[PDB]
CSV table of C-alpha atoms in Angstrom, one decimal:
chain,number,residue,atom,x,y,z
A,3,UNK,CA,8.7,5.8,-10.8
A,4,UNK,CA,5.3,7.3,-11.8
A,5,UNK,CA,2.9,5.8,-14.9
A,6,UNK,CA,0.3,5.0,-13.0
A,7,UNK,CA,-0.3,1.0,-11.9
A,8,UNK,CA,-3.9,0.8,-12.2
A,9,UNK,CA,-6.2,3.0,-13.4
A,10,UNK,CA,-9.9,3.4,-12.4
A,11,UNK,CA,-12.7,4.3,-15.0
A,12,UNK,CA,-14.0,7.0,-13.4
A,13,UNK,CA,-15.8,8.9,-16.6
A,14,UNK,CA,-30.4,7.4,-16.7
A,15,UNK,CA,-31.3,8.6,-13.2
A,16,UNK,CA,-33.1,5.1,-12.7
A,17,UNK,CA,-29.3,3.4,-11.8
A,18,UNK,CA,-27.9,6.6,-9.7
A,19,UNK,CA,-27.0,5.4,-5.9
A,20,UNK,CA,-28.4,2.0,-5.6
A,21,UNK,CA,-27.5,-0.1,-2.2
A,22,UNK,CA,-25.5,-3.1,-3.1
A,23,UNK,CA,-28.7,-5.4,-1.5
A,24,UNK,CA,-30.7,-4.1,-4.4
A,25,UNK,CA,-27.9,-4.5,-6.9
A,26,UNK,CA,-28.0,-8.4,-5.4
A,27,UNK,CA,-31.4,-8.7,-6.1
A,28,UNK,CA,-31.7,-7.1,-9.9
A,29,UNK,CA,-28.4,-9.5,-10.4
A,30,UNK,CA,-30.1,-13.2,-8.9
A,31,UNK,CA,-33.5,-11.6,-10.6
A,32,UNK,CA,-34.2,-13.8,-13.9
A,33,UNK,CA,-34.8,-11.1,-15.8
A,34,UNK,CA,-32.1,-10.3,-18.0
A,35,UNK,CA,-33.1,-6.6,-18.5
A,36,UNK,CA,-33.3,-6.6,-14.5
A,37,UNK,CA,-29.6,-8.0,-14.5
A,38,UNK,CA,-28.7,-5.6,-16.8
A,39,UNK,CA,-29.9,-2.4,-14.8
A,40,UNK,CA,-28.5,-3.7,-11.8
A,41,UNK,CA,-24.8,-4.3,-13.1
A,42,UNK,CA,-25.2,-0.6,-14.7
A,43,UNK,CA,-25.6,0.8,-11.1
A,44,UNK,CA,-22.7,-1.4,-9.8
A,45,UNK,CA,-20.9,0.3,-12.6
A,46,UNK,CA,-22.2,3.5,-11.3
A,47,UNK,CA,-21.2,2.8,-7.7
A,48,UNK,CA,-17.3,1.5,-8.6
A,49,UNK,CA,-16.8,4.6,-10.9
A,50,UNK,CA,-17.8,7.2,-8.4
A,51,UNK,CA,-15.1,9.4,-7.3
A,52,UNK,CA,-14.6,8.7,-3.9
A,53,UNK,CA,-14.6,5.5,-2.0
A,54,UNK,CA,-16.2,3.1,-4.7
A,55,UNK,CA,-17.4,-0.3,-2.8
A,56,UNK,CA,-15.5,-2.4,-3.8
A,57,UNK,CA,-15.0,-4.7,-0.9
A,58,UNK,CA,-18.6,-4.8,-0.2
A,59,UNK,CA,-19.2,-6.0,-4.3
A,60,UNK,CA,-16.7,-8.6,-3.7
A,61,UNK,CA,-18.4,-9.9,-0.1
A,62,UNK,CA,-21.9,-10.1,-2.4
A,63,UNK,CA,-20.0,-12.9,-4.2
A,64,UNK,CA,-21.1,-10.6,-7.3
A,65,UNK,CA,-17.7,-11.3,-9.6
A,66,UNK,CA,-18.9,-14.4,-11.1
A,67,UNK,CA,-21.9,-13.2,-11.9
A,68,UNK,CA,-20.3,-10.2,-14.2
A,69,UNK,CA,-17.4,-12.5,-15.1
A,70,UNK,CA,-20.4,-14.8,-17.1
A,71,UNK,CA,-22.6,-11.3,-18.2
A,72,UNK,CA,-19.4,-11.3,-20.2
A,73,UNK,CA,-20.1,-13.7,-22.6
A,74,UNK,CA,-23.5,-12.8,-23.0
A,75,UNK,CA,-22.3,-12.0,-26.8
A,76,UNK,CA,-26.7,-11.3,-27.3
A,77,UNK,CA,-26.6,-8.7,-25.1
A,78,UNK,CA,-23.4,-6.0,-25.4
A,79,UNK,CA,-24.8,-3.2,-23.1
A,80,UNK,CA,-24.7,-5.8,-20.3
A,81,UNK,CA,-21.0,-7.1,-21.6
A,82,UNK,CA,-20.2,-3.4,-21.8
A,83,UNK,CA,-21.2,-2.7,-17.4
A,84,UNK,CA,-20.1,-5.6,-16.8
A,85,UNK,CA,-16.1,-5.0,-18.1
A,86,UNK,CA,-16.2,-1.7,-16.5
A,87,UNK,CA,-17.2,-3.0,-13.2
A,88,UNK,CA,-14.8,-5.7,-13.3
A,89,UNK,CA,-11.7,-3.2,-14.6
A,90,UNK,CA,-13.0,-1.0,-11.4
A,91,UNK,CA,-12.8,-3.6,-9.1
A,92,UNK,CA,-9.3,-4.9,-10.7
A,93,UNK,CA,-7.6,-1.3,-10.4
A,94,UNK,CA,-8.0,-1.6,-6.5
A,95,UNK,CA,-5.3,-3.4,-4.4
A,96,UNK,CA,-3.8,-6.7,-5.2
A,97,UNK,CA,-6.2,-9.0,-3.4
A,98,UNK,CA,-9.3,-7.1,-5.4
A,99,UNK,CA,-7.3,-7.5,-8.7
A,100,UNK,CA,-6.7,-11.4,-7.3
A,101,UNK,CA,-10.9,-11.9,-7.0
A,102,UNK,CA,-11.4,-11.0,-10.6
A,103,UNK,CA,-8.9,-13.0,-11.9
A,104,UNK,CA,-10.2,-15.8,-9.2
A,105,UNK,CA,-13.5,-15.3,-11.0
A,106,UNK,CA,-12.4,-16.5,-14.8
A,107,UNK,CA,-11.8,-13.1,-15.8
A,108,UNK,CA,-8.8,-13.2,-17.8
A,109,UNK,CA,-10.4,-15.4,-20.5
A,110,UNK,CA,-13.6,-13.7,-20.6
A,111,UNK,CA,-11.8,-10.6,-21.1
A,112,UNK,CA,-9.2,-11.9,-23.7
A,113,UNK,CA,-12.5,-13.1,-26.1
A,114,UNK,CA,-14.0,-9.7,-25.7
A,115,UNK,CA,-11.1,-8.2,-27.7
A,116,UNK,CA,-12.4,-9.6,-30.7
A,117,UNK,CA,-15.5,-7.8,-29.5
A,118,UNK,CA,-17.1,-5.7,-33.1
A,119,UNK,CA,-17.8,-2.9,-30.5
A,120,UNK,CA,-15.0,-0.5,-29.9
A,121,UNK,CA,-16.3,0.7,-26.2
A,122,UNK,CA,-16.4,-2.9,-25.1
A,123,UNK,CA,-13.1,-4.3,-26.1
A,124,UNK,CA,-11.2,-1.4,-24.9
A,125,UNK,CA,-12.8,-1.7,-22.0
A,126,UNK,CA,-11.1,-5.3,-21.7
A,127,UNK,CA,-7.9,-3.7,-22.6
A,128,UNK,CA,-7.9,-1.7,-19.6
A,129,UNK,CA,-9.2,-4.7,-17.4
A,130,UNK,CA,-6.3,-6.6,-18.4
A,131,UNK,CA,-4.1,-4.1,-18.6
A,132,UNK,CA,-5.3,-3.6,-14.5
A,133,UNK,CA,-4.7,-7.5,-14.1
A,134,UNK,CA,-1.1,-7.0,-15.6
A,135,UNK,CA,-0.4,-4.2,-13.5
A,136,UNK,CA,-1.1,-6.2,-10.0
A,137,UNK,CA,2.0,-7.9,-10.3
A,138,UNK,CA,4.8,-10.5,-12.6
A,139,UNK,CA,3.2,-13.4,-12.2
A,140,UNK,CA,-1.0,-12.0,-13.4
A,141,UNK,CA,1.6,-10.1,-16.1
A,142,UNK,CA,2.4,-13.6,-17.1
A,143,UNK,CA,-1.3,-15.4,-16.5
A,144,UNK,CA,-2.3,-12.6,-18.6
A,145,UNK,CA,0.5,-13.5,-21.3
A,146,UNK,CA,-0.4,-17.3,-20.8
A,147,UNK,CA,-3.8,-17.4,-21.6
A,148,UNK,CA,-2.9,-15.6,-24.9
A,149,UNK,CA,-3.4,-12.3,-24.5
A,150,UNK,CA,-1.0,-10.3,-26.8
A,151,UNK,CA,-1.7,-11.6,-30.4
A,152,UNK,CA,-5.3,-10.0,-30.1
A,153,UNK,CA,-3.9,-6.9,-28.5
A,154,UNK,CA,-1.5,-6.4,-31.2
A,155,UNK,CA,-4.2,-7.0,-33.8
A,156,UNK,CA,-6.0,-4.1,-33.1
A,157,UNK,CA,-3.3,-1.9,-34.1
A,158,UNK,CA,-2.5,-3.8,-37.1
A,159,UNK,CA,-3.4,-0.4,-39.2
A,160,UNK,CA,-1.8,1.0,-41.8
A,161,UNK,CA,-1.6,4.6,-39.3
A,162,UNK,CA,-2.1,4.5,-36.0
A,163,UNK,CA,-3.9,8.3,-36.6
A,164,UNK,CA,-7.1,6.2,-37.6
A,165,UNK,CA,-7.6,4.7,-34.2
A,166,UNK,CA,-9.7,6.8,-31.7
A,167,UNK,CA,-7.3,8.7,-29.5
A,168,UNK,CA,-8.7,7.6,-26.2
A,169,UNK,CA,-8.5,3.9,-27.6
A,170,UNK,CA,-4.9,4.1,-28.7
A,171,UNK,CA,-4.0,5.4,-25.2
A,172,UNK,CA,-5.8,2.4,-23.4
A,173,UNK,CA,-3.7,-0.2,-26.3
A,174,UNK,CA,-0.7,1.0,-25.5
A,175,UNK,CA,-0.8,1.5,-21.4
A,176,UNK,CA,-2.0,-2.2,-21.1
A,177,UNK,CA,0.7,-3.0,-23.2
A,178,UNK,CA,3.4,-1.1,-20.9
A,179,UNK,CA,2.5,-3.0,-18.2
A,180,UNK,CA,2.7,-6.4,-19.9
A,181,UNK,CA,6.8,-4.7,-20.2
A,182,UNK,CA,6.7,-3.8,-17.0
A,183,UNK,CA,7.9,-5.3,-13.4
A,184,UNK,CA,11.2,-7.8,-12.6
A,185,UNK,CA,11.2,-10.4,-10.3
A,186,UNK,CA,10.9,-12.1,-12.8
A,187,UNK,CA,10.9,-10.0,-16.1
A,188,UNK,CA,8.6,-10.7,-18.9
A,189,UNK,CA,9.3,-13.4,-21.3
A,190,UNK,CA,11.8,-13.0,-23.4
A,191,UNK,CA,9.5,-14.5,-26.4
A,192,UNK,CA,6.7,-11.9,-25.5
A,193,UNK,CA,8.6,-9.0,-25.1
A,194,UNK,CA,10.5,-9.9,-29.0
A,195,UNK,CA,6.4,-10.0,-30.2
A,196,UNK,CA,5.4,-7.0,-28.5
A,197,UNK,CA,8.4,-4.9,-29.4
A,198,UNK,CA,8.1,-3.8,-33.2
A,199,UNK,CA,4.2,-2.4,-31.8
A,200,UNK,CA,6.3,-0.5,-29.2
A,201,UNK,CA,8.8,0.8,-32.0
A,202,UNK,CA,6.0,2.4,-33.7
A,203,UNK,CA,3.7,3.7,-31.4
A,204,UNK,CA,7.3,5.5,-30.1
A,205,UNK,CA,7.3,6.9,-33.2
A,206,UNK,CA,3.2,8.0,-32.9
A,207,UNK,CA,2.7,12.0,-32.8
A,208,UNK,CA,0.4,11.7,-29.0
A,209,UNK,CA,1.9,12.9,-25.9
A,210,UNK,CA,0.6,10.6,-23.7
A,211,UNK,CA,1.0,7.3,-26.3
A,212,UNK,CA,5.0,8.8,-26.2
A,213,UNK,CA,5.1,9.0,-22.4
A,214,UNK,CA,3.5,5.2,-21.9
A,215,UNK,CA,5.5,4.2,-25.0
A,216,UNK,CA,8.6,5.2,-23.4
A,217,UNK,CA,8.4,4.1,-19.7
A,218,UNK,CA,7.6,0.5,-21.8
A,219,UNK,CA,11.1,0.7,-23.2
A,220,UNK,CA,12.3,1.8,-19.9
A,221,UNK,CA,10.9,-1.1,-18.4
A,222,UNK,CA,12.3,-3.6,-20.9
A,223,UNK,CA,16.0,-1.7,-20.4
A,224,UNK,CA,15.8,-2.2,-16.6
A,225,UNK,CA,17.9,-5.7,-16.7
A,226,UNK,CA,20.7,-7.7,-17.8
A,227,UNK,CA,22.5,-6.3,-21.5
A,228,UNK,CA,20.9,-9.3,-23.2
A,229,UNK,CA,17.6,-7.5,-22.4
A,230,UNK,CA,18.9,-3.8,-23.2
A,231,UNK,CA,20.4,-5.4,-26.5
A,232,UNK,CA,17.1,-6.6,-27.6
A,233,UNK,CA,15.6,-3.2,-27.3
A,234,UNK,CA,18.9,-1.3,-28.6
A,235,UNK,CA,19.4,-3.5,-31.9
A,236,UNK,CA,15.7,-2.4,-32.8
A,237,UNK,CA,17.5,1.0,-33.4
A,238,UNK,CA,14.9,2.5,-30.9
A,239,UNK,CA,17.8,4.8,-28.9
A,240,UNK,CA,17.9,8.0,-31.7
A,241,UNK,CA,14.1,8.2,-31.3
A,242,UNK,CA,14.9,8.2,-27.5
A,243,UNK,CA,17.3,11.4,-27.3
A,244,UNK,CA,15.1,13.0,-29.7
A,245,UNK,CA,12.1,12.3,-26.9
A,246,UNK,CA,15.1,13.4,-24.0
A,247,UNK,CA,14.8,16.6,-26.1
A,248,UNK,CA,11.3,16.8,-25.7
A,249,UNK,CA,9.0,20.1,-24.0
A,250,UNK,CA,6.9,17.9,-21.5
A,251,UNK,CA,8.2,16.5,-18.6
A,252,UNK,CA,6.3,13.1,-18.7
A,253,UNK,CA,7.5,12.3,-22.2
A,254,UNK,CA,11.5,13.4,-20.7
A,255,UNK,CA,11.1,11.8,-17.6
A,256,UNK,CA,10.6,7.8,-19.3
A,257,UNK,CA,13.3,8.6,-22.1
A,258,UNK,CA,15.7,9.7,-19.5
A,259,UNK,CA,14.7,6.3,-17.3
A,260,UNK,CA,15.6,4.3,-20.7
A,261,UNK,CA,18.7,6.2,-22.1
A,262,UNK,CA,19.9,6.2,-18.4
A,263,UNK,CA,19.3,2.1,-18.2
A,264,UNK,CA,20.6,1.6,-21.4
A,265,UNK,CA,24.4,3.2,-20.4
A,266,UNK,CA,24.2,0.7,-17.3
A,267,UNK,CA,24.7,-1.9,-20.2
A,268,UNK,CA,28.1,-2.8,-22.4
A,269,UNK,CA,30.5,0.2,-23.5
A,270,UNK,CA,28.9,-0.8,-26.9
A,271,UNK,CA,25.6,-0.3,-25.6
A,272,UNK,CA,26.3,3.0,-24.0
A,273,UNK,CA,28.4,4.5,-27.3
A,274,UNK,CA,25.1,4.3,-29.1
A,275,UNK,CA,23.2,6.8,-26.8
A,276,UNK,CA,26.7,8.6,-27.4
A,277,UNK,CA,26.9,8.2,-31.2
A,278,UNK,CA,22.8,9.1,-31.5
A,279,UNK,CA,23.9,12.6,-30.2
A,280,UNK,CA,22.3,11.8,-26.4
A,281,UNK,CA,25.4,14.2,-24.9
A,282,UNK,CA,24.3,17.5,-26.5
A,283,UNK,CA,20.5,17.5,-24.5
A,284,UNK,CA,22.8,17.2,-21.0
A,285,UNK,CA,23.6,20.5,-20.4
A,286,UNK,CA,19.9,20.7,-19.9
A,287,UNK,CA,19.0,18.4,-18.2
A,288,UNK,CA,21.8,18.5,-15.6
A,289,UNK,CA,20.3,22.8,-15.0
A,290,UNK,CA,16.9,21.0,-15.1
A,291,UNK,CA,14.0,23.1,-12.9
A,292,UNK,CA,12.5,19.3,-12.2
A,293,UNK,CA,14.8,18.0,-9.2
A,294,UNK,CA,14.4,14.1,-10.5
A,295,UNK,CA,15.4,14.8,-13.8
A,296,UNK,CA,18.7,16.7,-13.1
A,297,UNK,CA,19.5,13.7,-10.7
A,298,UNK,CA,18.9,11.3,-13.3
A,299,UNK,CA,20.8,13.0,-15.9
A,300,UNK,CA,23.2,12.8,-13.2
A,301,UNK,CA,23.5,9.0,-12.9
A,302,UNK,CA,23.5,8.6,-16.2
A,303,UNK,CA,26.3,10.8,-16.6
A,304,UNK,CA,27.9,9.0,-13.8
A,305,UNK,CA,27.6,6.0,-16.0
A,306,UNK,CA,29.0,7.1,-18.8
A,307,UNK,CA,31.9,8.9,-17.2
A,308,UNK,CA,32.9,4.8,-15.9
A,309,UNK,CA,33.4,4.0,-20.3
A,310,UNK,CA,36.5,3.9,-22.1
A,311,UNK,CA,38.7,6.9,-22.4
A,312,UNK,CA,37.1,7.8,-25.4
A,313,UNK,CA,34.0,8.1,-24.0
A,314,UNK,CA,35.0,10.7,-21.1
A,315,UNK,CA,36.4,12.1,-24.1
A,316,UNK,CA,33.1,12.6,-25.3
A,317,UNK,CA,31.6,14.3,-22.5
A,318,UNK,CA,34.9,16.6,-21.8
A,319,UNK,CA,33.8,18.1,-25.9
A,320,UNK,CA,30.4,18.5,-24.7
A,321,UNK,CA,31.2,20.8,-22.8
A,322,UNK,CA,29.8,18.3,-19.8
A,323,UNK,CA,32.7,18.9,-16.8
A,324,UNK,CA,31.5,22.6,-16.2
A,325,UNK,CA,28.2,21.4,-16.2
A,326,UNK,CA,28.9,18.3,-13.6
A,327,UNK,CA,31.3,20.8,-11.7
A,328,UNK,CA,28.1,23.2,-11.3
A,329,UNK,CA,25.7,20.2,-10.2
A,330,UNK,CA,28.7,19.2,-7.5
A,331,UNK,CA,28.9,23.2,-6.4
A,332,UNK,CA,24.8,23.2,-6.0
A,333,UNK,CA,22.2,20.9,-6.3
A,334,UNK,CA,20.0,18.7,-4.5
A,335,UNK,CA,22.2,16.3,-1.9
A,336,UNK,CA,21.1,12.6,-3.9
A,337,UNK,CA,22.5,14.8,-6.9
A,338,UNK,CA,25.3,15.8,-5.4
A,339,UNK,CA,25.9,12.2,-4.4
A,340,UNK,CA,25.5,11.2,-7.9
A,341,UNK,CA,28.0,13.9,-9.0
A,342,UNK,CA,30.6,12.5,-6.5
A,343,UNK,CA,30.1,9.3,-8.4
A,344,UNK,CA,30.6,11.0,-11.9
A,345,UNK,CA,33.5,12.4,-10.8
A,346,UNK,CA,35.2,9.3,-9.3
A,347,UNK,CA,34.4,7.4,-11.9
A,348,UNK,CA,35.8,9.8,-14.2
A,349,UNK,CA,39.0,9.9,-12.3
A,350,UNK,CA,39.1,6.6,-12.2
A,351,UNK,CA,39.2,5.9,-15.6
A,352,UNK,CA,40.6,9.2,-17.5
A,353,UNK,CA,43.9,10.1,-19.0
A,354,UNK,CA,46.2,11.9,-17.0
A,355,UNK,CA,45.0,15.5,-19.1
A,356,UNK,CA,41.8,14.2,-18.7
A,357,UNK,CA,42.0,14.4,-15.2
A,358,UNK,CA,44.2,17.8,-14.8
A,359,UNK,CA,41.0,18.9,-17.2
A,360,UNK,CA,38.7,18.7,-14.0
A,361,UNK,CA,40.7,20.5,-11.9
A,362,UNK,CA,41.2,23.0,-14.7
A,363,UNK,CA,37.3,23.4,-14.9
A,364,UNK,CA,37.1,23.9,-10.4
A,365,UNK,CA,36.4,20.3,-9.5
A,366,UNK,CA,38.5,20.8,-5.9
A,367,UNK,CA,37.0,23.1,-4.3
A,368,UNK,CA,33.0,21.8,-4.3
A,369,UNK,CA,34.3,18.4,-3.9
A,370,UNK,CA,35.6,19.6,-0.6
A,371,UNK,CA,32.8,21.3,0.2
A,372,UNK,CA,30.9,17.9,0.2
A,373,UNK,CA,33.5,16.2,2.2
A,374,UNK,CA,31.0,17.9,5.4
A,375,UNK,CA,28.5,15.8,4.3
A,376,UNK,CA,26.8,13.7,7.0
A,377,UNK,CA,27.2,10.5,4.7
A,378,UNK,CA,29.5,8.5,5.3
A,379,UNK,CA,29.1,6.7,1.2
A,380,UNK,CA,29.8,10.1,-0.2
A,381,UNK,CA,32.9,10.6,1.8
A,382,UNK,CA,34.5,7.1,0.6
A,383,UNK,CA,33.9,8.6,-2.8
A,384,UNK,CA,35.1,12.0,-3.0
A,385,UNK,CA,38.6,10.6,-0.7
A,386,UNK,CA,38.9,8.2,-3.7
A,387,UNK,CA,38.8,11.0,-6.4
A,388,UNK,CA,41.0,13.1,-4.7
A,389,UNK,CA,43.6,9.7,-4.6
A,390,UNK,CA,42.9,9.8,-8.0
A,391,UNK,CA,43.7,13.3,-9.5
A,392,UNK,CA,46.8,13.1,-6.8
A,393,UNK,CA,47.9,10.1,-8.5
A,394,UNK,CA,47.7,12.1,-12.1
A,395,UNK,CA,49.3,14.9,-10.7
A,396,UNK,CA,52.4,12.9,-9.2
A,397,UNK,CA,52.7,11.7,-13.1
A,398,UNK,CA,53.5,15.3,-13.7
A,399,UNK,CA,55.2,16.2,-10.7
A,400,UNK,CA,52.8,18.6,-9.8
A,401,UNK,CA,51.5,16.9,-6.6
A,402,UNK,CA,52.9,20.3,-4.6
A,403,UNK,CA,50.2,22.5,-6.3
A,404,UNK,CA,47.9,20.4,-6.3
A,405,UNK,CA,48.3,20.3,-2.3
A,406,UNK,CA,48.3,24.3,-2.0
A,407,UNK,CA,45.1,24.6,-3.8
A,408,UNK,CA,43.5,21.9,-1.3
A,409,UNK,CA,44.2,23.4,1.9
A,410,UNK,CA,43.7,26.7,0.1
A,411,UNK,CA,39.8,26.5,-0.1
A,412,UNK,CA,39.6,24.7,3.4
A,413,UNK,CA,40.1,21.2,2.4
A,414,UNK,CA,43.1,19.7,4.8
A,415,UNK,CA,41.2,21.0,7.1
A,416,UNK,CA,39.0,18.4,6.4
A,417,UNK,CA,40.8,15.6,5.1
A,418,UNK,CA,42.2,16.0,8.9
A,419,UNK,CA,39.0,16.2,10.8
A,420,UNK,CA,38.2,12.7,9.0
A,421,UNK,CA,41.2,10.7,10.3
A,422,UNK,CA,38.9,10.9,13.8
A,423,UNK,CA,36.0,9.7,11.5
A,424,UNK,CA,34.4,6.4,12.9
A,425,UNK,CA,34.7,4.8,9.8
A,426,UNK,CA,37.4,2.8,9.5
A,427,UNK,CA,37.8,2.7,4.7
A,428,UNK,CA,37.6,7.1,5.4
A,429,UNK,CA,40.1,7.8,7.9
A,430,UNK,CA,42.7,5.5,6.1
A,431,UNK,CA,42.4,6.7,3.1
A,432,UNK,CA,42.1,10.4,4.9
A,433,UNK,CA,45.5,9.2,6.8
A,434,UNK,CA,47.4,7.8,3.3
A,435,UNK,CA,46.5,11.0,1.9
A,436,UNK,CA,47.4,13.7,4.7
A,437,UNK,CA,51.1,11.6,5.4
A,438,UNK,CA,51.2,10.9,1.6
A,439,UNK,CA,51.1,14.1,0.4
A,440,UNK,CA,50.7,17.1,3.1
């Protein structure tokens, strides 16, 4: 969704504005004091705000030149321009992340993580944590050449409050994006050796440690159940719905991505966002002012409303239908559309009260509202819920009522109009409904 990719390190009048020609020339000068001027105004030109070079640093071939400044171990100022230029020109697009990595980089980077100056080794956190972010298979060059033992090192401390803030921030964004992207996911060793880091810094009292933190765990959710188990068994989901509860948006917006992945998984899976209290947050976050989070919540309620019995139970004590009847009445449409899908899913898998429940609460008449809807998905879906709750209602012989309070509110009207529908899954079901019960 939204943590950022890459990020650019954008924060002596003698290095202000160089040309790149002159940067050339301090670099190939054998003058190591020259060399490190020279890279300091490189540094100055790729941190600018607004159209940094970095195209025109790559065509000077100068990458392997600041890829060996490096390891010049005698000389940290020059290590120090060096890792910011290189992080500046990894944050571009992938083929400017590529040339650094074509360069060496990764290993020069990983030994400057031992580095005994803080400024310097968080700058190669950042630089790798840029690398990472191109792509799965740096992610995994990155991983290969041993980069996660020494990032976890340095926040092997007895509290994470001792670190410098900044610092802490740059740890654990590089380490969201060794979490982070699918095709394929991350190793299924690294992610077990990176996890208990991410447990605690989940638990860390920053804002913007919790967001990262989160959209890691997001990441690590997005996949098969044998990947959501891993993160679920490290008892991580309470801290999540306590995050859900949260006042800022970027800290809600990853623990809703997680807790909303993590009911995609087994009905197990999903009662423990249930049983860690996730429910009682919904009826804000289905009213929530930010349009992606109430369509989110939405999903996920869709989700759960496709569990056992008990677990519709669950969100009919909640209080949850009125809520999910209100997002159907109003909302953005691709919430809408993920109420339709609540709602059918609920059908399908209620009890018979259950399901007389919905209508109870006003469920007919938005739903046929939405049968307008130029969306031919949408349709399928409400004509299925409506088979549904018939289907409940013929269990109680109250399929005549049921009827009257459709064409009431303007629905056979509709159901009608749709046998003419140039679908050919709507207008049957339209058809078997109109013949089956008007």
């Amino acid at each position: 969704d939204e943590q950022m990719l890459k990020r650019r390190n954008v924060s002596n009048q003698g290095t202000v504005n160089w040309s790149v020609e002159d940067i050339v020339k301090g670099i190939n000068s054998n003058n190591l004091e020259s060399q490190l001027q020279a890279t300091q105004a490189a540094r100055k030109l790729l941190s600018r705000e607004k159209q940094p070079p970095i195209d025109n640093i790559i065509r000077a071939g100068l990458i392997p030149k600041f890829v060996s400044f490096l390891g010049k171990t005698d000389c940290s100022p020059i290590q120090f321009e060096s890792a910011w230029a290189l992080t500046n020109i990894a944050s571009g697009t992938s083929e400017q992340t590529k040339a650094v990595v074509d360069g060496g980089a990764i290993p020069a980077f990983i030994s400057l993580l031992a580095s005994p100056h803080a400024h310097i080794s968080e700058q190669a956190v950042w630089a790798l944590g840029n690398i990472a972010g191109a792509g799965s298979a740096f992610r995994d060059l990155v991983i290969k050449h041993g980069a996660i033992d020494p990032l976890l090192a340095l926040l092997a401390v007895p509290d994470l409050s001792t670190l410098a803030c900044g610092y802490l921030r740059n740890l654990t964004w590089t380490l969201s994006n060794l979490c982070r992207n699918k095709n394929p996911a991350p190793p299924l060793d690294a992610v077990e050796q990176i996890l208990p880091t991410l447990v605690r810094l989940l638990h860390h009292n920053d804002p913007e440690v919790l967001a990262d933190s989160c959209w890691a765990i997001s990441y690590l959710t997005d996949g098969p159940n044998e990947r959501i188990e891993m993160v679920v068994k490290k008892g991580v989901v309470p801290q999540l719905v306590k995050l859900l509860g949260a006042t800022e948006l970027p800290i809600v917006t990853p623990a809703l991505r997680a807790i909303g992945n993590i009911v995609t998984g087994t009905d197990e899976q999903t009662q423990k966002v249930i049983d860690a209290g996730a429910l009682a947050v919904f009826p804000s976050l289905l009213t929530n002012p930010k349009t992606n989070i109430q369509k989110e919540a939405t999903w996920t309620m869709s989700n759960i409303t496709a569990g056992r019995q008990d677990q519709i139970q669950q969100v009919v004590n909640h209080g949850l239908v009125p809520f999910l009847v209100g997002v159907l009445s109003k909302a953005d449409f691709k919430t809408q559309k993920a109420a339709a899908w609540a709602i059918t899913n609920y059908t399908s898998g209620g009890t018979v009260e259950q399901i007389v429940y919905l209508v109870h609460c006003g469920i007919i008449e938005p739903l046929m509202n939405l049968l307008s809807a130029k969306d031919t998905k949408i349709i399928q879906v409400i004509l299925d819920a409506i088979s549904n709750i018939f289907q409940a209602a013929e269990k109680l012989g109250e399929t005549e009522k049921l009827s009257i309070m459709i064409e009431e509110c303007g629905g056979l009207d509709k159901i009608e109009a749709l046998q003419r529908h140039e679908n050919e899954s709507v207008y049957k079901a339209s058809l078997n409904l109109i013949e089956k019960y008007f």
